[PDB]
């Protein structure tokens, strides 16, 4: 059975580029392409693609559910079984929906979060896609209530594979593979179980047009610190003389603050939160 | 005597040729007893030895859940490795893990393991004290910091001292007639002449279990440590193993040479001498 794949991604903007490859008999050999609704009717009047089909610029005509068959000369039919299916979804065909996380984007390891996609546009389906993932976007039917259509995607139990940058999309009836422009991205972070750091303030949590800097430090070797106000900031950690690793976030000229440690090359997983600290103005 | 349980897993990315593949296998001593293969149709841990086949359904549900969890974790670790080593997403890479434990004759814990390789090279390993980690390069040094910040060695220590040893002891009993057996080698010698002045003496050992064995050649007493062609011990396919050792001898001197066979199945080690 040939292995079909889209590169770099099956979710692709109109005007972008995507390559369909058909790997069969240790070769990306000669192959023909088929779409759903065409079944055993080869697309492009039976074009026998040679190496890999570069669709560029991508148009809405490239959207579809594709399978390939590869050349098999010493065979009865001369060709191979149909490959696995690859769904090319073309984005940028409607105005973007909105994406928000309930209760919020910071998710304790093992827990759950709802990513709600919604729009004033009446989308029949919504898709949720984590950036850089080859998995099929998750698909749900749009529910209609009070001038908006929406869909609640349940994410969890939370872990590193589910953290990252998410976008959601809408599509309308009869063109399901033609997706909207992506929603504004939402970063979903898994917190724990790394050891929570400590939060402190300079000169202190009591200020009245005065400036304050909040220090987040730890014995664990965090490379990054993240300061969160209940009502988002990022800074590299510096090796201090206790061998501790600190970062100083200047705030001034209040709020309840927590901070989280983070490691190099791992931007979506943070420590347990520090204990809350209240800056009172 | 002493015994061991090992789980070995291999994770392979193969962009454009297949989805990432995860294969895990469980052994007691030299005897495989389970497998999981992410590409196979069952998506279950499967028995690969008769004596585990009578484990109840809850065992297979529990083991399947854990090995699938491992599959997901190591397939994410492939992605992480690309970032740590600044490698491109087009290449194929290999991520291997081994964990398990040894027990002595008394069934008490002797050693535990929990270690990883990336592209055929040591990556990170749990130390003998089961409390600290050996990181083999700067990328694994990141993992070490994370794992220290998470105190994860505690969970490894708890598994190795309790669950792993408890399972090994249980399996040793389940498969006693096959795991605690000791099949001796059947031996013989072949002779082949190289020239008018040399010949090859090959000492053969076949049908033995476990796979541990010593074949050695001596000439008048001093063993030919660096003149003996040794072949890696190979599986016969029925659960026994085979091995041979050969030495090159001046024709007419075959009587000076003796092959020595040491194996737990032998009451007394064998001293074999070729004769026409």
């Amino acid at each position: 059975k040939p292995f079909l794949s889209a590169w770099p991604s099956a979710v692709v903007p109109r005007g972008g580029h995507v390559t369909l490859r058909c790997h069969y008999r240790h070769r990306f050999n000669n192959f023909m392409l088929y779409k759903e609704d065409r079944i055993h009717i080869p697309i492009f009047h039976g074009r026998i693609f040679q190496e890999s089909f570069n669709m560029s610029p991508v148009t809405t005509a490239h959207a579809g559910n594709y399978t390939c068959r590869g050349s098999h000369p010493h065979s009865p039919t001369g060709w191979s079984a149909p490959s696995n299916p690859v769904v090319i979804m073309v984005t940028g065909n409607h105005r973007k929906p909105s994406l928000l996380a309930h209760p919020g984007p910071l998710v304790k390891s093992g827990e759950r979060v709802i990513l709600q996609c919604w729009s004033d546009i009446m989308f029949e389906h919504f898709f949720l896609h984590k950036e850089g993932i080859s998995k099929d976007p998750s698909r749900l039917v749009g529910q209609i209530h009070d001038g908006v259509s929406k869909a609640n995607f349940s994410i969890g139990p939370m872990m590193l594979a589910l953290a990252g940058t998410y976008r959601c999309y809408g599509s309308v009836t009869h063109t399901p593979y033609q997706l909207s422009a992506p929603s504004d991205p939402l970063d979903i972070v898994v917190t724990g179980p790394y050891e929570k750091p400590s939060l402190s303030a300079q000169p202190g949590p009591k200020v009245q047009g005065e400036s304050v800097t909040l220090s987040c430090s730890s014995r664990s070797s965090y490379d990054m610190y993240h300061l969160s106000r209940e009502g988002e900031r990022r800074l590299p950690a510096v090796r201090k003389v206790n061998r501790t690793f600190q970062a100083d976030f200047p705030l001034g000229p209040g709020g309840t603050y927590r901070c989280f440690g983070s490691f190099r090359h791992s931007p979506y997983e943070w420590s347990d939160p520090s204990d809350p600290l209240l800056v009172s103005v | 005597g002493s015994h061991s349980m090992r789980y070995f897993s291999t994770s392979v990315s193969r962009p454009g040729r297949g989805e990432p593949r995860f294969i895990a296998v469980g052994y007691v001593d030299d005897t495989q007893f389970v497998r999981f293969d992410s590409d196979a149709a069952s998506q279950r841990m499967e028995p690969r030895a008769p004596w585990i086949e009578q484990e109840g359904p809850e065992y297979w549900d529990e083991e399947t859940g854990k090995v699938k969890a491992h599959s997901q974790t190591d397939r994410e670790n492939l992605r992480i490795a690309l970032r740590y080593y600044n490698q491109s997403e087009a290449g194929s890479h290999t991520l291997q893990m081994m964990f398990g434990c040894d027990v002595g004759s008394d069934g008490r814990f002797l050693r535990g393991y929990h270690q990883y390789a990336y592209d055929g090279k040591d990556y990170i390993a749990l130390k003998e004290d089961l409390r600290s980690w050996t990181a083999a390069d700067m990328a694994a040094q990141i993992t070490k910091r994370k794992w220290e910040a998470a105190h994860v060695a505690e969970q490894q220590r708890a598994y190795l001292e309790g669950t792993c040893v408890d399972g090994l002891r249980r399996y040793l009993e389940n498969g006693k007639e096959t795991l605690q057996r000791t099949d001796p080698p059947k031996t013989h010698m072949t002779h082949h002449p190289i020239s008018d002045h040399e010949a090859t003496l090959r000492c053969w050992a076949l049908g033995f279990y476990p796979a541990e064995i010593t074949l050695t050649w001596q000439r008048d007493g001093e063993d030919q440590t660096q003149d003996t062609e040794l072949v890696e011990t190979r599986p016969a396919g029925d659960g026994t193993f085979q091995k041979w050792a050969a030495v090159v001898v001046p024709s007419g001197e075959e009587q000076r040479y003796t092959c020595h066979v040491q194996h737990e199945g032998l009451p007394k080690p064998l001293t074999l001498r070729w004769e026409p």
């Binding site: 997983e269 | 789980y7 083991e63 854990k66 974790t73 992480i80 929990h114 994860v152 792993c164 408890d166």
Partner: peptide
């Protein structure tokens, strides 16, 4: 008896 392998690199 398999181990829970849950901590990523």
């Amino acid at each position: 008896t398999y181990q829970w392998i849950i901590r990523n690199w």
